[PDB]
Amino acid sequence: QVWGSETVASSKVGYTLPSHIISTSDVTRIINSSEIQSAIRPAGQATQKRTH
RNA sequence: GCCCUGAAAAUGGAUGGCGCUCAAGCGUGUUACCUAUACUCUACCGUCAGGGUUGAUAUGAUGCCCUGACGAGUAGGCAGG
Ligand SMILES: [Mg+2]
Ligand SMILES: [Mg+2]
Ligand SMILES: [Mg+2]
């Protein structure tokens, strides 16, 4: 009642809860999604060999 | 050309000094040699630039790592402590 919900308006006059700018906070799961993984090229070594 | 005369100033006095006369002087030529915080190569510190790497089960993605170049400073500006 005090802060409102998706189906209940907050008792505060004209107030609504802040909106998220990102759907989820786990970016690793987003990267591991099939859509992203099927569009990227294979990675490297994480520590480049010294050639000279 | 060199040397000499012309050429007289006040404390004692300065090719830097000693000293030097086929010079250790003057003109010229040929080599060797000495040494700057400059140049070449290497290491380390920092700065800037271009790149690699989120995959869980081990910790900093402002993380870790690869490559190249650069570094004087009053007045003054900015940044990290
Ligand atoms: Mg001579
Ligand atoms: Mg030097
Ligand atoms: Mg400086």
Side-chain angles (χ1 to χ4, degrees), chain A residues 28 31-32 37 41 43-44 46-48 50:
Chain A
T28 302
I31 297 181
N32 290 10
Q37 286 296 327
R41 47 93 178 174
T47 296
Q48 295 165 279
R50 300 211 299 168

Coordinates of all heavy atoms in Angstrom, one line a residue, chain A residues 28 31-32 37 41 43-44 46-48 50, chain B residues 51-56 64-68:
Chain A
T28 N 27.0 -12.1 -17.3 CA 27.6 -13.4 -17.8 C 26.6 -14.3 -18.4 O 26.9 -14.9 -19.5 CB 28.3 -14.1 -16.6 OG1 29.3 -13.2 -16.1 CG2 29.0 -15.3 -17.1
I31 N 25.8 -13.0 -21.9 CA 26.9 -13.4 -22.9 C 26.8 -14.9 -23.2 O 27.1 -15.3 -24.4 CB 28.3 -13.0 -22.3 CG1 28.4 -11.5 -22.1 CG2 29.4 -13.5 -23.2 CD1 29.7 -11.0 -21.5
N32 N 26.5 -15.7 -22.2 CA 26.4 -17.1 -22.5 C 25.1 -17.5 -23.2 O 24.9 -18.7 -23.5 CB 26.4 -17.9 -21.1 CG 27.8 -17.8 -20.5 OD1 28.6 -17.1 -20.9 ND2 27.9 -18.6 -19.4
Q37 N 26.3 -16.1 -28.4 CA 27.4 -17.0 -28.7 C 27.5 -17.4 -30.1 O 28.6 -17.8 -30.6 CB 27.3 -18.2 -27.8 CG 27.6 -17.9 -26.3 CD 29.1 -17.5 -26.1 OE1 30.0 -18.0 -26.8 NE2 29.3 -16.7 -25.1
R41 N 33.1 -14.3 -32.9 CA 34.2 -15.1 -33.4 C 35.0 -15.7 -32.3 O 34.9 -15.3 -31.1 CB 35.1 -14.2 -34.3 CG 35.5 -12.9 -33.6 CD 36.8 -12.9 -32.8 NE 37.1 -11.6 -32.2 CZ 38.1 -11.4 -31.4 NH1 38.9 -12.4 -31.0 NH2 38.3 -10.2 -30.9
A43 N 37.7 -16.7 -29.5 CA 38.6 -15.8 -28.8 C 40.0 -16.2 -28.9 O 40.4 -17.1 -29.7 CB 38.2 -15.8 -27.3
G44 N 40.9 -15.6 -28.1 CA 42.3 -15.8 -28.2 C 42.8 -16.7 -27.0 O 42.3 -17.8 -26.8
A46 N 44.2 -15.3 -23.8 CA 44.2 -14.5 -22.5 C 45.5 -14.1 -22.0 O 45.6 -13.4 -21.1 CB 43.4 -15.3 -21.4
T47 N 46.6 -14.6 -22.7 CA 48.0 -14.2 -22.3 C 48.8 -14.4 -23.6 O 49.2 -15.5 -23.9 CB 48.6 -14.9 -21.2 OG1 47.8 -14.6 -20.0 CG2 50.0 -14.5 -20.9
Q48 N 49.0 -13.3 -24.4 CA 49.6 -13.4 -25.7 C 51.1 -13.9 -25.6 O 51.9 -13.4 -24.7 CB 49.6 -12.1 -26.4 CG 48.1 -11.7 -26.7 CD 48.0 -10.2 -27.1 OE1 48.0 -9.3 -26.3 NE2 48.0 -9.9 -28.4
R50 N 54.9 -14.0 -26.5 CA 55.9 -13.0 -27.0 C 56.6 -13.6 -28.2 O 57.3 -14.7 -28.2 CB 56.9 -12.7 -25.9 CG 56.3 -12.1 -24.6 CD 57.2 -11.1 -23.9 NE 58.5 -11.8 -23.5 CZ 59.5 -11.1 -23.1 NH1 59.6 -9.8 -23.1 NH2 60.6 -11.8 -22.7
Chain B
rG51 P 43.0 -0.1 -31.7 OP1 42.1 0.0 -32.9 OP2 42.4 0.3 -30.4 O5' 43.6 -1.5 -31.7 C5' 43.1 -2.5 -30.8 C4' 44.1 -3.6 -30.6 O4' 45.2 -3.2 -29.9 C3' 43.6 -4.8 -29.7 O3' 42.7 -5.7 -30.5 C2' 44.9 -5.4 -29.2 O2' 45.5 -6.2 -30.2 C1' 45.7 -4.2 -29.0 N9 45.5 -3.6 -27.6 C8 45.0 -2.4 -27.3 N7 45.0 -2.3 -26.0 C5 45.5 -3.4 -25.5 C6 45.8 -3.8 -24.1 O6 45.6 -3.2 -23.1 N1 46.4 -5.0 -24.0 C2 46.7 -5.8 -25.1 N2 47.3 -7.0 -24.8 N3 46.5 -5.5 -26.4 C4 45.9 -4.3 -26.5
rG52 P 41.5 -6.4 -29.8 OP1 40.6 -7.0 -30.8 OP2 40.9 -5.5 -28.8 O5' 42.2 -7.6 -28.9 C5' 43.0 -8.6 -29.6 C4' 43.6 -9.5 -28.6 O4' 44.6 -8.7 -27.8 C3' 42.7 -10.2 -27.6 O3' 42.1 -11.3 -28.1 C2' 43.7 -10.5 -26.5 O2' 44.5 -11.6 -26.8 C1' 44.6 -9.3 -26.5 N9 44.2 -8.2 -25.5 C8 43.7 -7.0 -25.8 N7 43.4 -6.3 -24.8 C5 43.7 -7.1 -23.7 C6 43.6 -6.9 -22.3 O6 43.2 -5.9 -21.7 N1 44.1 -7.9 -21.6 C2 44.6 -9.1 -22.1 N2 45.0 -10.0 -21.3 N3 44.7 -9.3 -23.4 C4 44.2 -8.3 -24.2
rU53 P 40.6 -11.7 -27.8 OP1 40.2 -12.9 -28.5 OP2 39.8 -10.4 -28.0 O5' 40.6 -12.0 -26.2 C5' 41.1 -13.2 -25.7 C4' 41.1 -13.1 -24.2 O4' 42.0 -12.1 -23.7 C3' 39.8 -12.9 -23.5 O3' 39.0 -14.1 -23.4 C2' 40.2 -12.4 -22.2 O2' 40.7 -13.4 -21.3 C1' 41.5 -11.5 -22.5 N1 41.1 -10.1 -22.7 C2 41.0 -9.3 -21.6 O2 41.2 -9.7 -20.5 N3 40.7 -8.0 -21.9 C4 40.5 -7.4 -23.1 O4 40.2 -6.2 -23.2 C5 40.6 -8.3 -24.2 C6 40.9 -9.6 -24.0
rU54 P 37.4 -14.0 -23.4 OP1 36.9 -14.9 -24.5 OP2 37.1 -12.5 -23.6 O5' 37.0 -14.5 -22.0 C5' 36.6 -13.6 -21.0 C4' 35.4 -14.0 -20.2 O4' 35.4 -13.5 -18.9 C3' 34.1 -13.5 -20.9 O3' 33.1 -14.5 -20.7 C2' 33.7 -12.3 -19.9 O2' 32.3 -12.0 -19.9 C1' 34.2 -12.8 -18.6 N1 34.4 -11.8 -17.6 C2 34.2 -12.2 -16.3 O2 33.8 -13.3 -16.0 N3 34.4 -11.2 -15.3 C4 34.8 -9.9 -15.6 O4 34.9 -9.1 -14.6 C5 35.0 -9.6 -17.0 C6 34.8 -10.5 -17.9
rG55 P 32.9 -15.6 -21.8 OP1 34.3 -16.2 -22.1 OP2 32.1 -15.1 -23.0 O5' 32.1 -16.8 -21.1 C5' 32.1 -16.8 -19.6 C4' 32.6 -18.2 -19.2 O4' 33.7 -18.7 -20.0 C3' 33.2 -18.3 -17.8 O3' 32.2 -18.3 -16.8 C2' 34.0 -19.5 -17.8 O2' 33.2 -20.7 -17.7 C1' 34.5 -19.5 -19.3 N9 35.9 -19.0 -19.4 C8 36.9 -19.6 -20.1 N7 38.1 -19.0 -20.0 C5 37.8 -17.9 -19.2 C6 38.7 -16.8 -18.9 O6 39.9 -16.7 -19.1 N1 38.1 -15.9 -18.1 C2 36.8 -15.9 -17.7 N2 36.4 -14.9 -16.9 N3 35.9 -16.9 -18.0 C4 36.5 -17.8 -18.8
rA56 P 32.4 -17.5 -15.4 OP1 31.5 -16.3 -15.4 OP2 33.9 -17.3 -15.2 O5' 31.9 -18.4 -14.3 C5' 30.9 -19.4 -14.5 C4' 31.4 -20.8 -14.3 O4' 32.4 -21.0 -15.3 C3' 32.0 -21.1 -13.0 O3' 31.0 -21.4 -12.0 C2' 32.9 -22.3 -13.3 O2' 32.2 -23.5 -13.4 C1' 33.4 -21.9 -14.7 N9 34.7 -21.2 -14.6 C8 35.1 -20.2 -13.8 N7 36.3 -19.7 -14.0 C5 36.7 -20.4 -15.1 C6 37.9 -20.4 -15.9 N6 38.9 -19.6 -15.6 N1 38.0 -21.2 -17.0 C2 36.9 -22.0 -17.2 N3 35.8 -22.1 -16.6 C4 35.7 -21.3 -15.5
rC64 P 46.5 -5.5 -12.2 OP1 47.4 -5.5 -11.1 OP2 46.3 -4.3 -13.1 O5' 46.8 -6.7 -13.2 C5' 46.9 -8.0 -12.7 C4' 46.8 -9.1 -13.7 O4' 45.5 -9.0 -14.4 C3' 47.8 -8.9 -14.9 O3' 49.1 -9.4 -14.6 C2' 47.1 -9.7 -16.0 O2' 47.2 -11.1 -15.8 C1' 45.6 -9.3 -15.7 N1 45.2 -8.2 -16.5 C2 44.8 -8.3 -17.8 O2 44.8 -9.5 -18.3 N3 44.4 -7.3 -18.6 C4 44.4 -6.1 -18.0 N4 44.0 -5.0 -18.8 C5 44.8 -5.8 -16.7 C6 45.2 -6.9 -16.0
rC65 P 50.4 -8.6 -15.2 OP1 51.6 -9.3 -14.6 OP2 50.2 -7.2 -14.9 O5' 50.3 -8.9 -16.8 C5' 50.6 -10.2 -17.3 C4' 50.2 -10.3 -18.7 O4' 48.8 -9.8 -18.9 C3' 51.0 -9.4 -19.7 O3' 52.2 -10.0 -20.1 C2' 50.0 -9.3 -20.9 O2' 50.0 -10.5 -21.7 C1' 48.6 -9.2 -20.2 N1 48.2 -7.8 -20.0 C2 47.6 -7.2 -21.2 O2 47.4 -7.9 -22.2 N3 47.1 -6.0 -21.1 C4 47.3 -5.3 -19.9 N4 46.8 -4.0 -19.9 C5 47.9 -5.9 -18.8 C6 48.3 -7.1 -18.9
rC66 P 53.4 -9.1 -20.7 OP1 54.6 -9.9 -20.6 OP2 53.3 -7.8 -20.0 O5' 53.0 -8.9 -22.2 C5' 52.9 -10.0 -23.1 C4' 52.5 -9.6 -24.5 O4' 51.1 -9.1 -24.4 C3' 53.3 -8.4 -25.1 O3' 54.5 -8.9 -25.6 C2' 52.3 -7.9 -26.1 O2' 52.3 -8.7 -27.3 C1' 51.0 -8.0 -25.4 N1 50.6 -6.8 -24.6 C2 50.1 -5.7 -25.4 O2 50.0 -5.8 -26.6 N3 49.7 -4.6 -24.7 C4 49.8 -4.5 -23.4 N4 49.4 -3.4 -22.8 C5 50.3 -5.6 -22.6 C6 50.7 -6.7 -23.3
rU67 P 55.8 -7.9 -25.7 OP1 56.9 -8.6 -26.2 OP2 55.9 -7.2 -24.3 O5' 55.4 -6.8 -26.7 C5' 55.3 -7.1 -28.1 C4' 54.8 -5.9 -28.9 O4' 53.5 -5.5 -28.5 C3' 55.7 -4.6 -28.7 O3' 56.9 -4.6 -29.4 C2' 54.7 -3.5 -29.2 O2' 54.6 -3.5 -30.6 C1' 53.4 -4.1 -28.6 N1 53.0 -3.5 -27.3 C2 52.5 -2.3 -27.3 O2 52.2 -1.6 -28.3 N3 52.2 -1.8 -26.0 C4 52.4 -2.5 -24.8 O4 52.0 -1.9 -23.8 C5 52.9 -3.8 -24.9 C6 53.2 -4.2 -26.2
rG68 P 58.1 -3.8 -28.9 OP1 59.3 -4.3 -29.6 OP2 58.1 -3.9 -27.4 O5' 57.9 -2.3 -29.4 C5' 57.8 -2.0 -30.7 C4' 57.2 -0.6 -30.9 O4' 55.8 -0.6 -30.4 C3' 57.9 0.6 -30.2 O3' 59.0 1.0 -30.9 C2' 56.8 1.6 -30.1 O2' 56.6 2.3 -31.4 C1' 55.6 0.7 -29.9 N9 55.3 0.6 -28.4 C8 55.6 -0.4 -27.6 N7 55.2 -0.2 -26.4 C5 54.6 1.0 -26.4 C6 54.0 1.8 -25.3 O6 53.9 1.5 -24.1 N1 53.6 3.0 -25.8 C2 53.7 3.5 -27.1 N2 53.2 4.7 -27.3 N3 54.2 2.8 -28.0 C4 54.7 1.6 -27.6

